[PDB]
Design a protein around this nucleic acid. Structure first.
Ligand SMILES: [Mg+2]
Ligand SMILES: [Mg+2]
Ligand SMILES: [Mg+2]
Ligand SMILES: [Mg+2]
Ligand SMILES: [Mg+2]
Ligand SMILES: [Mg+2]
Ligand SMILES: [Mg+2]
Ligand SMILES: [Mg+2]
Ligand SMILES: [Mg+2]
Ligand SMILES: [Mg+2]
Ligand SMILES: [Mg+2]
Ligand SMILES: [Mg+2]
Ligand SMILES: [Mg+2]
Ligand SMILES: [Mg+2]
Ligand SMILES: [Mg+2]
Ligand SMILES: [Mg+2]
Ligand SMILES: [Mg+2]
Ligand SMILES: [Zn+2]
Lengths: 99, 155, 119, 24, 83, 127, 206, 60
RNA sequence: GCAUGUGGUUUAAUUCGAAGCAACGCGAAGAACCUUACCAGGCCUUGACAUGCUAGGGAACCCGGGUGAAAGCCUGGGGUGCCC
RNA sequence: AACCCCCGCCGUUAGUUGCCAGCGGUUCGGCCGGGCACUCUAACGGGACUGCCCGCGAAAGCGGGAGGAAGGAGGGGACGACGUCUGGUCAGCAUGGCCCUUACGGCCUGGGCGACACACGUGCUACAAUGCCCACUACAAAGCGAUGCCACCCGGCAACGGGGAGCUAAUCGCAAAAAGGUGGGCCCAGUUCGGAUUGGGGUCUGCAACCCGACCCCAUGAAGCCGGAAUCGCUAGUAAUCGCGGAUCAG
């Protein structure tokens, strides 16, 4: 029924964040298809270590978009409020779908 | 090297016939890795050879190799004031390369228009005693002898 | 046979053989076998005389080719010459006209390399 | 060719499409 | 070159000095800094000064110098040789 | 009845199914040749089968995604390989010192910075 | 100039980012631009308070500016008087929900950037170059750190010949990832010029 | 960074073509990532302090 | 042969720096104006920018014309909030 | 040196937008029911230690093997010691100092960094038959995209223009992978090799393509038949060869 999409930066909070959520959609009246690991995306930046001329010496950075997605089957009115009284991870961005 | 001798590359034995020599030749035809070409280059030379001098194309190969395999070579070197071209005997494997090496190198220096053709001819022509293949073999056994004048500087 | 004022390569394919004129390339050719419907695959030596003329008129009359075209082109620049413009001053001095760099390289347009002495 | 424009691979090389490289 | 789906191009301030001195049947030397513009057949017979870096250059406009831009008749640098 | 093996090699993955019957091979629907045409390493994929006497003993249902047909054929082969220990955990004796049970741990190394293509560097006269 | 920054090495290995958000392609560009104003004003002022590590966690247009600092009552004033002056001067720059806290630097020698500062100060202060750096380190294995090291690096003492100096002690092992070390870049200013300074401290293997 | 030349790129221009970015942090528009509004010197310099979230140091 | 840097010449200017390997498709992971430090012209003088001081007028501000290559300058009008 | 990441085997949590071995239906398209087996998908753990054997050896080690996906560090990355070359940049920024401050500072349009008797340094495509070309035919990984990616439809030989469905992106799109495969055309030729430099015709981005752009079509079809002395790279999935992608950025 109601689907969530977590898009963050860690692999830590993003797993933590989504496993607090995964407990109060079991106790509160819902069967659930578990925590879902998704097609992470990488944006990398290759850059000249040097101020000036020394080109062929280069540094490497990767910004890792981490995608999580959990499905709630049978969403109660014992539920929906239990997950707006669970909200607490800091670097995460949550979103809420429903078809 | 400078830490030990290499073990030498253990090839896939031939897919069709089965000789490990057949392998190293196919690779030694091959350019730029395009190996599914040189496999056909080979296996059309066996259609020509089995059908132009009707015996086992595989046996001619074995022989077309024995006949270009040199036995002495000029392993050059230096004293302290000038350097001498020098007679030297040859390794077992060193043959097997220069064999196939030269077999090819001739086939490309052959004049015909076709690929597996200039292999087929320079495979009979090797296992005869003529063609550019054997000419060079008997040429660095010839510079083994017409240069025997310093077989005391040999190593 | 003969067309445009030139004897085309006998023994050779039709399509190739027409490139060998100063009015025709790869395309304008195989489209004149479209528009005169003779098998492009066959040779210039195996035609009919019937199938000769039929390509002769179309090829000659329609396009501008041969002597007339290098003539037009060797004039069309002769144009850009006296104009006073940028491009004409180049066709004169034999420097590239299409703006390419000219420090290094740019050979086929200048001739060969006439060598001097640095310092 | 490859530096050649009016051809198969020579388009592909440039990246382009033309009468000599279709869009299917 | 210049899109036909979007017609020719000329700068306004420059065309202004042309079809006012056209509309008064006179001819004077114009001084403008556009080169970026396409000469048109309603300028033919005008005395027009175009700029290269430092100098306004004498370019009286005849016939078949039609669709060519202005900057083709006003060399930008100076090259006679190396010694 | 079906015996299955896990076949993988160099950014290409292959799935094997060994039923008792003929020796027909469907690789993504198509026959063994209508998918591995004028290609020679092709018929080599079956090697791990013929060192225990069974080409004609089993059928072949196949699936592959990724890599090129060589890197698939290595995986196909490594699939018929693994597949035979699920039938005979005794065939293991025959096809390890014969070498057919191993992931070709070989892999297209990373392109490096400063080096045209990882290992290759730039030419320089006037050294 | 051969080696690498210690912090920028353990990026989520034995350290952590200061600004810890999320962001889209639209937002990250602007959003961050903001933090580098937040951290330009915040710094410029708070200097003589001894400011250390500046967190800026983020939710839906709620900024969360925490602040570690030597001396929490020079951020404060008397009562709660001067902290308010700023707490809005930030919502004056953001245009939103500045939650500007305070957190004392408990032990001050056991946090690098401070250590760096007081020294770079002491150089601005026209002190004994060597002894500055010696005592610098001194106090660090006196407060109880695993390793210490300070790198004075200018035209030192007023000399025309630019050199460099330093000392250290204990474990300094920046090739062990699993060793937590804090870097302190300072940057004294004296009549003869500008004399960057460094300071590394080991606390422990984890 | 000629001061006034951060400003010739801050304000909006006569025509939209002249829209070249620059660094917020130093004013070098020579190599700038329109995702950081920052250049390569900066991006490291900063990333080396962990002041850009999720910007890890890369390796594979 | 073309592409790109570079040396040397040339230029009103062809802005800069890189200098044996360890400068030379290197600063440029994007020069038509922009970038732009360069040159030729038309210009601005508390200045495209900061925190202000003093004298005098002005709410901020927004719309139009004239001259012009654009800038720039001369100039018409709409406006007159906030604090005590 | 290890602890971090990537790749190699495998187990735990997971079944969407991915996956299809069995069963049901099937517009034959994993299309739908149903399933999450396996592939994949990211997070955490397991595993390799000279542990086992014969030999060599005071020992550390070494050589050959058994088992194992991996064997002696398994392959690859990040990782650069006290110091030197007064090496590099006041042209990212930072700053001592000398220096201008109705001028080197500031704004502007145009011109310039691209000029060309030459020379080197780097690379691209060639000089072709293991090939060129036109069709039909398969098999990739990685990354980007709601101010953009643009499936199809129509117009045009085409670039592209018009219309317009989907996509906060495993769901939609760039997307054609290319060398390979099938079938046929070329037959040693300055050539259907090669694709310069030119003549003309158009499309697009853009206030604006003369300096000074890219792309389309037509015609032009240059040098070069594998390269002097000298000299460069690479020890295995490397070298070579073939295609895809991203950053920068209207182009
Ligand atoms: Mg061609
Ligand atoms: Mg590769
Ligand atoms: Mg280089
Ligand atoms: Mg400055
Ligand atoms: Mg721009
Ligand atoms: Mg200088
Ligand atoms: Mg300019
Ligand atoms: Mg489902
Ligand atoms: Mg079924
Ligand atoms: Mg190490
Ligand atoms: Mg030097
Ligand atoms: Mg340049
Ligand atoms: Mg159509
Ligand atoms: Mg379109
Ligand atoms: Mg030839
Ligand atoms: Mg090596
Ligand atoms: Mg590419
Ligand atoms: Zn910058």
């Amino acid at each position: 029924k109601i689907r969530i999409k977590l898009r963050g930066f860690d692999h830590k909070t993003l797993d933590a964040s989504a496993q607090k959520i995964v407990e109060a959609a079991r106790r509160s009246g819902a069967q659930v298809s578990g925590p879902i690991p998704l097609p992470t995306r990488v944006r990398r930046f290759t850059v000249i270590r040097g101020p000036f001329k020394h080109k062929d010496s280069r540094e490497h950075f990767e910004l890792r978009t981490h995608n999580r997605l959990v499905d709630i089957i049978n969403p109660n009115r014992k539920t929906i409020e239990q997950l707006m009284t669970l909200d607490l991870p800091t670097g995460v961005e949550i979103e809420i779908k429903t078809v | 090297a400078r830490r030990r001798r290499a073990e030498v590359r253990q090839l896939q034995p031939d897919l069709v016939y089965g000789d490990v020599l057949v392998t190293a030749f196919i690779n030694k035809i091959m350019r730029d890795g395009k190996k599914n070409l040189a496999a056909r280059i080979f296996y059309d030379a066996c259609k020509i050879i089995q059908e132009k001098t009707g015996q086992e194309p595989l046996k001619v190969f074995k022989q077309a190799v024995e006949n270009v395999k040199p036995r002495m070579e000029v392993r050059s070197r230096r004293v302290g004031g000038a350097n001498y071209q020098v007679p030297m005997e040859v390794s077992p494997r060193r043959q097997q390369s220069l064999a196939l090496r030269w077999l090819v190198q001739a086939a490309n220096q052959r004049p015909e228009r076709r690929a597996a053709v200039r292999i087929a001819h320079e495979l009979m022509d090797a296992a005869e005693g003529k063609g550019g293949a054997v000419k060079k073999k008997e040429d660095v056994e010839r510079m083994a002898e017409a240069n025997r004048a310093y077989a005391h500087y040999r190593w | 046979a003969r067309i445009a004022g030139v004897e085309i390569p006998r023994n050779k394919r039709v399509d190739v053989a027409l490139t060998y004129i100063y009015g025709i390339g790869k395309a304008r050719a195989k489209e004149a076998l479209e528009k005169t419907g003779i098998n492009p695959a066959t040779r210039v030596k195996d035609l009919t005389e019937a199938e000769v003329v039929r390509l002769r008129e179309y090829v000659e009359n329609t396009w501008k080719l041969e002597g007339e075209l290098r003539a037009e082109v060797a004039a069309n620049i002769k144009r850009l010459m006296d104009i006073g413009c940028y491009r004409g001053l180049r066709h004169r001095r034999g420097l590239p006209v299409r703006g390419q760099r000219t420090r290094t390289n740019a050979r086929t347009r200048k001739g060969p390399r006439k060598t001097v002495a640095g310092k | 060719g490859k530096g050649d424009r009016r051809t198969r691979r020579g388009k592909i090389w440039r990246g382009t499409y033309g009468k000599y490289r279709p869009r299917k | 070159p210049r899109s036909l789906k979007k017609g020719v191009f000329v700068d306004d301030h420059l065309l202004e000095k042309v079809l006012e001195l056209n509309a008064k049947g006179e001819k004077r030397l114009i001084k403008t800094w556009s080169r970026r513009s396409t000469i048109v057949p309603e300028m033919v017979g005008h005395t027009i000064a175009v700029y290269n870096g430092k100098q306004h250059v004498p370019v009286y406009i005849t016939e078949n110098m039609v669709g060519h831009k202005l900057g083709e008749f006003a060399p930008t640098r100076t090259y006679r040789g190396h010694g | 009845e079906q015996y299955y093996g896990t076949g993988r090699r160099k950014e290409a993955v292959a799935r094997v199914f060994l039923r008792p019957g003929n020796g027909k091979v469907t690789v993504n629907g198509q026959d063994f040749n209508e998918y591995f045409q004028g290609l020679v390493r092709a018929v080599a994929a079956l090697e791990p089968l013929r060192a225990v006497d069974a080409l004609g003993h089993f059928d072949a249902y196949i699936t592959v995604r990724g890599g090129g047909k060589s890197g698939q054929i290595d995986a196909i082969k490594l699939g018929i390989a693994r597949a035979l220990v699920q039938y005979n955990p005794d065939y293991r004796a025959k096809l390890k010192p014969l070498g057919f049970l191993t992931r070709d741990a070989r892999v297209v190394e990373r392109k490096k910075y400063g080096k045209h293509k990882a290992r290759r560097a730039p030419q320089y006269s006037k050294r | 100039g051969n080696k690498i920054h210690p912090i920028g090495f353990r990026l989520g290995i034995t350290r952590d980012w200061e600004s810890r958000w999320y962001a889209g392609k639209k937002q990250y560009r602007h959003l961050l631009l903001e933090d580098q104003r937040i951290r330009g004003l915040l710094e410029k002022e708070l200097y003589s308070a001894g400011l250390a590590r500046v967190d800026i966690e983020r939710a839906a247009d709620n900024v969360a500016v925490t602040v570690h600092v030597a001396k929490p009552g020079v951020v404060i004033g008397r009562g709660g008087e001067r902290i308010r002056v700023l707490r809005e001067e930030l919502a004056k720059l953001t245009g939103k929900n500045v939650a500007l806290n305070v957190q004392e630097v408990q032990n001050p020698n056991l946090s690098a950037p401070l250590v760096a500062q007081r020294v770079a100060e002491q150089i601005e202060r026209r002190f004994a170059v060597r002894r500055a750096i010696k005592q610098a380190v001194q106090r660090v294995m006196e407060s109880g750190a695993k390793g210490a090291k300070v790198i004075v690096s200018g035209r030192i003492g007023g000399a025309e010949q630019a050199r460099t100096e330093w000392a250290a002690q204990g474990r300094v092992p920046l090739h062990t990832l699993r060793a937590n070390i804090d870097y302190g870049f300072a940057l004294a200013r004296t009549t003869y010029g500008v004399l960057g300074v460094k300071a590394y401290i080991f606390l422990g293997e984890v | 960074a000629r001061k006034a030349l951060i400003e010739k790129a801050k304000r909006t221009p006569k025509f939209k073509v002249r829209a070249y970015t620059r660094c917020v942090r130093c004013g070098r528009a020579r190599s700038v990532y329109r995702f950081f509004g920052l250049c390569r010197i900066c991006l490291r310099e900063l990333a080396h302090k962990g002041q850009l979230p999720g910007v890890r140091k890369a390796s594979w």
